[PDB]
Amino acid sequence: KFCRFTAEGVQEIDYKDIATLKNYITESGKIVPSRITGTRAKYQRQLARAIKRARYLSLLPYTDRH
Amino acid sequence: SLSTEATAKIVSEFGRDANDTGSTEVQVALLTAQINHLQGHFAEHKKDHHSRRGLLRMVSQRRKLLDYLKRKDVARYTQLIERLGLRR
Amino acid sequence: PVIKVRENEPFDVALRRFKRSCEKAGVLAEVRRREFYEKPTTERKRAKASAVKRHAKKLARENARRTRLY
Amino acid sequence: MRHYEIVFMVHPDQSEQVPGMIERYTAAITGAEGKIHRLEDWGRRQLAYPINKLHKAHYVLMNVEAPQEVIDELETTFRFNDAVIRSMVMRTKHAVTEASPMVKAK
Amino acid sequence: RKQVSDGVAHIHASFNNTIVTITDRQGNALGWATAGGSGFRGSRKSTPFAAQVAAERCADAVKEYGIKNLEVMVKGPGPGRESTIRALNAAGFRITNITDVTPIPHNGCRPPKKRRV
RNA sequence: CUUGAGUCUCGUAGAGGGGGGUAGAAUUCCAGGUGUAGCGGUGAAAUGCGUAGAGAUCUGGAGGAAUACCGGUGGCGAAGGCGGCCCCCUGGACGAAGACUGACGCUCAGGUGCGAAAGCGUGGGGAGCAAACAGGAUUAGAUACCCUGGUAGUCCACGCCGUAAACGAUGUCGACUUGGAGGUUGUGCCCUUGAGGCGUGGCUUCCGGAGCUAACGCGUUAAGUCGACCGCCUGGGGAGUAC
RNA sequence: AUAAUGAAAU
Known part of the structure; x- marks a missing residue:
């Protein structure tokens, strides 16, 4: 399945990249599975870490009702 | 573990040459250094x-x-x- | 699920939108699963059984298209 | 010496002390034979969820290289200062100098 | 009394009962009704029909404030999630929002044990 | 002497271990506003809470236990086991191209360490739910299953105890013997068509050939064909009991 | 929802 990060040869996923990270969360704020997106496992783990860092810094929400 | 500088220093001190990394003396000295450190x-x-x-x-x-x-x-x-x- | 009614929109359409959104979020499944305590042994057993059943069904259904019923 | 990335957030009603703060911390780091590789002041941003009944906080970002004791003292300073409301410190493998995504599309 | 013109309906739908409460936009109550108080007991209290009747009675009980627009908050898994909303729209308010506010923990307290009957 | 066994140089993936900080969701309790007859629970009920104002809804405060989504017949560890985010100390594994020592190895009675839940001692802490215990029920009876309450314990520091269907019911090390489909993690080359081909290592899931097996089944991660060392069995009860 | 028992041989 198509994986954008493998296509573009990325080295790190950059918790500061809100524009990219927004494509990988539902409208409730939850992390989208990998069998729906096509991502590889390495990059899926990196992505989860980045989303958690952003949530803590308050650049992303935890839920849709705060 | 030990650092590159400490490893090289011990190798120079105890070996016949900077390339002699396999002698019993060098191996024993490196093990002793790490045991003492821990x-x-x-x-x-x-x-x-x-x-x-x-x-x-x-x-x-x-x-x-x-x-x-x-x-x-x-x-x-x-x-x-x-x-x-x-x-x- | 937060749903806002659009101008000129009827009520049944909004109700259906709300139902679909709730189903996608999957709140009823969570509430049902969190009603009683489950032991880790039970949890692991359930996971393994589900995986084995799916694999066996796939093998059988893929091998059942090589024979004639009549 | 190790490489660190630092981010800190400041109360909206005290934006007039950010330059003095940056100057003081830069001096503290450079006084011990360190270096500063990236500095950015993002300005006021809307928060994703309230913190202490606030929105609209002020953000600053740094990438530095220094010894450990200096960073420990800086963390203590953050803890006891009252204008700072949140901070984060992370380690990096190498020095970073490029521009961030926040200063390329704002 | 005092006219309000904008309200919120809270719906508490559990496996055994349904509670409907109408409130202003600041959380102050104005009236309420329940399925167990509308003439249904036991195995008839946990049906969609009882919830419908309860919503009708709650709508009737707030007619002196002249309410026009309503928001709707729903909480719980029981039967009575949608019948109440239909009954309100029929009783004649204009619905502007619908929100689900069911509480979910992120791995918090230990639940009770399983029933062996 | 260099092929077994080790040391050195560059990188890579990981819920491996010890210590210290911190964030967001939810349950309970305390103090206030709005409002008024029910709430809660079951196969059906009543013990219980409530006009001394509950249940519901909104604002402020306290406390201590666990980390949704990601999350998979996925990963790490000698076994027991290990899951939010950040820092400090620390163990093992794997790959590419070289240099170095020169059999420095394998197994192990006695011995010495590690070792789930419950339990014991001293000092702390205590939302949630829970042996014992108390009261509704069901029943011919009900010292039970079901309902309403509830303390030891479950949590933390230090010290004991040494057992589990502690299981793959399969000891450790080495060599050899037809295939197919996947997962995860490194690495070399390119016709060139820069997004695709051709190889070469480690760990792991499922099917199946020869052989083997009382049968069920195992099958290059052997229960096949061989070598080195250790532990254990000899009809069922009495008994893993007595001294 | 609950809801027990049946000498030895032929």
Whole structure:
């Protein structure tokens, strides 16, 4: 399945990249599975870490009702 | 583990040349350095059982290398243990 | 699920939108699963059984298209 | 010496002290034979969720290289200062100098 | 009394009962009704029909404030999630929002044990 | 002597271990506003809470236990086991191209360490739910299953105890013997068509050939064909009991 | 929802 990060040869996923990270969360704020997106496992783990860092810094929400 | 600078210093001190990384003397000296270093770590973290397996393995390896050296050449053995201050 | 009614929109359409959104979020499944305590042994057993059943069904259904019924 | 990335957030009603703060911290780091590789002041941003009944906080970002004691003292300073409301410190493998995504599309 | 013109309906739908409460936009109550108080007991209290009747009675009980627009909050898994909303729209308010506010923990307290009957 | 076994140089993936900080969701309790007859629970009920104002809804405060989504017949560890984010100390594994020592090895009775839940001692802490215990019920009876309450314990520091269907019911090390489909993690080359081909290592899931097996089944991660060392069995009860 | 028992041989 198509994986954008493998296509573009990325080295790190950059918790500061809100524009990219927004494509990988539902409208409730939850992390989208990998069998729906096509991502590889390495990059899926990196992505989860980045989303958690952003949530803590308050650049992303935890839920849709705060 | 030990750092590159300390490793190179010990190799220079104890080997016949900077490329002699496989002699019994060099191996024993490196093991002794790391065993001495870890005493400080284990005096503060007394319930770190998983790290202590590596230390015990180091101790056993040093014992075996010393026995082999004592069997093959007594003079080198005596000089090395004097230089490192090892005995009970 | 937060649903806002658009201008000129009827009520049944908004109700259906709300139902679909709730189903996608999956709140009823969570509430049902969190009603009683489950032991870790039970949890692991359930996971393994589900995986084995799916694999066996796939093998059978893929091998059942090589024979004629009549 | 090791490489660190630092981010800190400041109360909206005290934006007039950010330059003095940056100057003081830069001096503290450079006084011990360190270096500063990236500095950015993002300005006021809307928060994702309230913190202490606030929105609209002020953000600053740094990438530095220094010894450990200096960073420990800096963390203590953050803890006891009252204008700072949140901070984060992370380690990096190498020095970073490029521009961030926040200063390329704002 | 005092006219309000904008309200919120809270719906508490559990496996055994349904509670409907109408409130202003600041959380102050104005009236309420329940399925167990509308003439249904036991095995008839946990049906969609009882919830419908309860919503009708709650709508009737707030007619002196002249409410026009309503928001709707729903909480719980029981039967009575949608019948109440239909009944309100029929009783004649204009619905502007619908939100689900069911509480979910992120691995918090230990639940009770399983029933062996 | 260099092929077994080790040391050195550059990188890579990981819920491996010890210590210290911190964030967001939810349950309970305390103090206030709005409002008024029910709430809660079951196969059906009543013990219980409530006009001394509950249940519901909104604002402020306290406390201590666990980390949704990601999350998979996925990963790490000698076994027991290990899951939010950040820092400090620390153990093992794997790959590419070289240099170095020169059999420095394998197994192990006695011995010494580690070792789930419950339990014991001293000092702390205590939302949630829970042996014992108390009261509704069901029943011919009900010292039970079901309902309403509830303390030891479950949590933390230090010290004991040494057992589990502690299981793959399969000891450790080495060599050899037809295939197919996947997962995860490194690495070399390119016709060139820069997004695709051709190789070469480690760990792991499922099917199946020869052989083997009382059968069920195992099958290059052997229960096949061989070598080195250790532990254990000899009809069912009495008994893993008595001294 | 609950809801027990049946000498030995032929």
